[PDB]
Amino acid sequence: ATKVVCVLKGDGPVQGIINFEQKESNGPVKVWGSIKGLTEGLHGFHVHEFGDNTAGCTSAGPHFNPLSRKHGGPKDEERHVGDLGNVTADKDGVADVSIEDSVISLSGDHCIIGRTLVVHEKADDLGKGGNEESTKTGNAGSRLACGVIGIAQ
Amino acid sequence: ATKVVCVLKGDGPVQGIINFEQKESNGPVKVWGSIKGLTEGLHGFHVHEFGDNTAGCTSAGPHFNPLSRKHGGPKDEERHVGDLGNVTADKDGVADVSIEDSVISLSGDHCIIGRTLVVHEKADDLGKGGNEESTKTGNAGSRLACGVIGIAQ
Ligand SMILES: O=C(Nc1ccccc1)c1ccccc1[SeH]
Ligand SMILES: O=C(Nc1ccccc1)c1ccccc1[SeH]
Ligand SMILES: [Zn+2]
Ligand SMILES: [Zn+2]
């Protein structure tokens, strides 16, 4: 019943449209849409803390982390609320996105409305890279495109 | 205290940053920042319903209007929640924005988080233009720049 949407833009050629939908407050969020202009393979896919694009995607701050946990894959107990893991771009540079997540929400204290969705330069190592940056960002590199997560029709 | 922010971008040169601060729930909201690339004079300045940028500023929908009223100035009893009236571009094309509104909120029913701020091509006539368009849009014309209203540090 709660419908939200995010348009991903950055300096470069990466852009996309991601829909979010949640039927029950406590229940899962379906995340789906398309992203084009990516390099083929995995790209880190995260909700960042701030709906702030004042200095581009950098202003968005870290992965949304209300419970002060270390970075992980979406399936781990130890993760950021914003840890949606990876999306996969085909050879034409298009990632078809379809995720269900039960840690993000479109209501309550884990609500992601007014926060930033970011698609990253390279693979999220899901906290398994064996360095400090692995358990903070997943070493997914720079922020290619982002947008503020907003209420849709 | 809640702090939110909006970056205004469009197809032309209008660019700006607008901060929103509310110290207590259903308290007044301070709106302040800077917009540049505006023609000298009054520009309609409204929160629109949808934080949806899929089709540029057009997909923002109409003025945020949860109480199903007609368009007016921010000081009118008959207004949209999104009716913030006008901002003034000086002779350099810069609008230094500073508004206090008690109808918009950053919590509860009148909350503008995940909605869209739009600066318009022309003056908001505050519903006194003597036509249908006046009682819906204030004849503010086209959407020069918009942004989704997001959570700030
Ligand atoms: O809904 C929100 N909070 C909220 C907090 C506690 C209980 C119920 C609801 C919210 C606040 C800001 C932005 C977006 C949302 Se969804
Ligand atoms: O505030 C929100 N929910 C909410 C829930 C319970 C009490 C008060 C408020 C909210 C939801 C979506 C967007 C923005 C806000 Se501010
Ligand atoms: Zn993380
Ligand atoms: Zn209006």
Side-chain angles (χ1 to χ4, degrees):
Chain A
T2 306
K3 261 154 170 171
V4 325
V5 67
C6 187
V7 178
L8 299 166
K9 301 288 175 42
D11 310 308
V14 179
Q15 52 184 329
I17 295 176
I18 307 294
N19 312 100
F20 305 75
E21 191 169 274
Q22 196 179 22
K23 291 144 147 189
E24 168 209 308
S25 87
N26 190 34
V29 182
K30 292 160 161 162
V31 186
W32 80 101
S34 178
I35 315 169
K36 63 178 189 198
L38 284 176
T39 61
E40 180 183 20
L42 292 164
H43 291 269
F45 191 66
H46 318 110
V47 181
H48 288 244
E49 187 180 0
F50 306 124
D52 190 334
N53 193 234
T54 42
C57 298
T58 328
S59 310
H63 304 166
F64 183 39
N65 187 24
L67 297 168
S68 298
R69 284 182 192 180
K70 287 173 151 189
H71 177 79
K75 298 173 62 197
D76 303 340
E77 278 155 314
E78 190 72 18
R79 54 170 276 198
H80 304 148
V81 162
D83 291 339
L84 297 185
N86 283 298
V87 300
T88 307
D90 65 41
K91 51 175 167 58
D92 296 349
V94 181
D96 288 314
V97 184
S98 183
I99 297 187
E100 295 205 327
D101 196 71
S102 286
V103 173
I104 62 159
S105 195
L106 305 181
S107 50
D109 293 330
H110 300 175
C111 186
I112 62 166
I113 297 160
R115 297 190 192 275
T116 300
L117 186 63
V118 179
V119 58
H120 284 275
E121 189 183 5
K122 50 201 200 189
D124 182 345
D125 68 19
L126 313 181
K128 306 192 185 291
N131 50 51
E132 184 169 354
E133 198 71 15
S134 186
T135 30
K136 296 205 227 268
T137 69
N139 292 299
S142 77
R143 307 163 182 213
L144 295 180
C146 63
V148 182
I149 298 165
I151 294 166
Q153 47 276 282
Chain B
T2 312
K3 213 180 164 168
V4 316
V5 67
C6 193
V7 178
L8 301 171
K9 213 205 210 309
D11 287 298
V14 179
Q15 307 141 56
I17 298 161
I18 301 293
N19 315 103
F20 299 76
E21 198 167 292
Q22 185 180 44
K23 285 233 174 81
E24 41 156 27
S25 63
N26 59 265
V29 180
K30 285 175 186 163
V31 187
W32 84 96
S34 184
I35 311 167
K36 53 213 67 260
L38 289 168
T39 50
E40 174 161 24
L42 297 167
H43 289 277
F45 186 69
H46 318 110
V47 183
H48 291 240
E49 188 177 357
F50 304 125
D52 179 342
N53 192 46
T54 54
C57 297
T58 306
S59 28
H63 297 175
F64 176 46
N65 190 27
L67 312 182
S68 290
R69 301 262 180 68
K70 304 306 194 175
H71 184 75
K75 281 163 59 69
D76 291 315
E77 179 46 7
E78 196 67 7
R79 55 173 275 198
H80 304 140
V81 170
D83 289 337
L84 294 184
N86 287 293
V87 304
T88 310
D90 69 11
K91 78 200 231 310
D92 291 304
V94 181
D96 289 311
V97 185
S98 188
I99 282 164
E100 206 170 277
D101 194 68
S102 292
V103 175
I104 65 169
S105 192
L106 309 180
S107 56
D109 306 336
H110 296 193
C111 184
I112 62 173
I113 300 177
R115 301 197 185 268
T116 292
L117 186 62
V118 182
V119 64
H120 286 269
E121 136 190 70
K122 283 144 66 167
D124 189 339
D125 68 16
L126 315 177
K128 314 171 67 179
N131 54 29
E132 274 268 8
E133 200 55 53
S134 190
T135 63
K136 291 169 62 153
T137 67
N139 289 299
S142 75
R143 307 174 188 205
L144 294 177
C146 58
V148 185
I149 302 177
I151 292 160
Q153 188 161 28

